[PDB]
Amino acid sequence: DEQPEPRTRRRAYLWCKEFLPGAWRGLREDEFHISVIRGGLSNMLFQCSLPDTTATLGDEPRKVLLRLYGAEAMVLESVMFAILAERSLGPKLYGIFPQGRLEQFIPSRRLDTEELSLPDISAEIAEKMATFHGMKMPFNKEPKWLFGTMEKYLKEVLRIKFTEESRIKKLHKLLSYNLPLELENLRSLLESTPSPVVFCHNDCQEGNILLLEGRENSEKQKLMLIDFEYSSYNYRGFDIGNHFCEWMYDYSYEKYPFFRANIRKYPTKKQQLHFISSYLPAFQNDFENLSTEEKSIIKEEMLLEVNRFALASHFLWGLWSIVQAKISSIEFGYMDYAQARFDAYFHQKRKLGV
Template sequence: MKRLHVTIPLDAPDNLVSLLTDDCQNYEIVKLKGALTNVIYKLSIRDSSGTSTSYLVRIFGAKLESLVDRVEEFNNITRVPPVVGYVNVLYVFDNGRVEYFLEGFKSVSAKQMVQQNVYRVLAQKFKALHCLVSITDKEIAHHRDGMCWYKLGQWIEIIENINGGEWIDSRDHQNVTEILLCRDWATFKKTVLNYKNWLLEEDAESFQQMKFCHNDAQQGNILLDSKTKDDDIPNLNLIDYEYSGVNAIQFDLANFLTECMHDYEIDESYKCHGEQYPSKEKVLDFLYHYSTHLHHGDSKGEASIVKLYNSVLKWRAASQLFWSVWAILQSGQLEAASAKIEAHVPDKGSNRVTSSDDPNEEVFDYMGFCNEKLSYFWGDMIKFNLASKEDCIVSKVRYLDTEFI
């Protein structure tokens, strides 16, 4: 991996051509869809011999550089087993990187996410990632309760402290009631803490068995060989390790299941569709193929799968909470205070959803996304008796199955 000390404008990836090769007869640049984190391009360069080489160019967004530690991300990429995901980083520049382009692969569709042949192979990818990547005592100590709770703590503190809590207090506290669907900020924080403490008590084992996790397995990060037919065993590639790190495996698995409720390729892509959440039978099948793959001393009997099912159910709300708080930081509503954020957590950067100057390109509704996620978060909190209907805007709350086996 070579370091290029250059900043590439979001709309000018062709500036990289002369840096990548001295022998360029012609080149082609195509902006790609499907990435929810960066602006990405396919850059194809043809040399004098007629040989064409294709690269994937990722240019990181400039918003709120407090969400992703790029040094940690690059380190994590090098640890990913090829059986899980092939990411070959060739060059790193100041605001992005260049990888070899994976020809013939494309992001899975929402329909494919819940296809049996796809989710079974993905379950095995998760197990390989969790089992084959070693984690250090230093990592465990740094993320004692897992990456998700570590980052949530940082992000909630940012929202609370930026400009003296301006976002919380603005519009006569309507941000809290309309976006967070909560009676007041104190109740929101109390509910989050109660939920975490409940997990620590009711699911203590999950905190004691942390693994290296992807943490963001959504449509754009699951690539499928386009030659795969509906009934084939698919060739999948799990990419994009911006939010990877030490975490509870239950968060990783639950996050995939909640992502099945989204379709980022349609209008109103911010919406959650509860009816698309996998059925109990599909979840158990998914967890069976996870548990029985690479059997490393963990029990693979029916009792252990039921136990994992119940544990994943408990962690589901953590995924909804994580991405809802993330969305507030990404929304742009805190941009006026971004200098403080950068000073708080230096040398970091991310922008989950591509922004564009193209007036015809849809702008992602971060606050709508936050609101949708939290409607199901509150549903789980009420069902688990961790919040009352008086704590939230109950008319907006939606429910998923929370029945344990």
């Protein structure tokens, strides 16, 4: 039960005391409870709570999550979080201030990578993603994020000056593919691949999926999608394909490079069909009433869409990871991860015949 720095205890006390109603408003500092959930220099997380000896007066929460930003994107993330809260699709928003926010505390654990392929879990992930994809949001609907971001990252990658010989070497190999050519060939392929533009999560991986406490044996509604920091209007195919890619990566590996990759854990076509069979009726209400025939066509075309867009997930994250090898302060094998993503890019390309 890790205690925060005294400075952070006092600030957390004041934010809770001033932003939360009822018993919080009169709470003594010496009866304030706080423990560190995630440390670091940015995006730090703390649990704050009333003493067990203090009764609630109304509907105020007894326990909350404090998120600290630490080390216009802020306007947009805050507005998004507030709207998702109002719509019961994310944790409630209790307080917002320059340094962070107070959010609803949701008893839960994160999923592990192996759990993504469980048929019931996968079905519910698909339903939750489809629900998210139906959200009308006050943000730019031109789907510029995907290629805008890859172009931005590639610009950065070509200008990196590594000093470490192992990274110099790995970078030269990755750039030997002619990444500008490959990106513009990918742009050509996806231009010819229909995919509706919807509000996408953009990071649907096990670490962003809560298994809700007390719901673990429930048939449905045991999950919640969280961490919408990178959510935007984007091609639907990307959100689904990106999720499929995440079946292959275990970030809990406790030896350098601090991930495991397995190409054979990508969902099989059978598994992919199971996922999209749950997605579609959740996204298009009367989908079930279509003939078995029309449903089959729509499913086949979606399989093609999502597996092509999976290529963009590899390329995007490969580029992202090279930049992180230059700019990150976390211990992680970023260059080896980049190579894993580009390996999967070319393996997938070959399987698609593209």
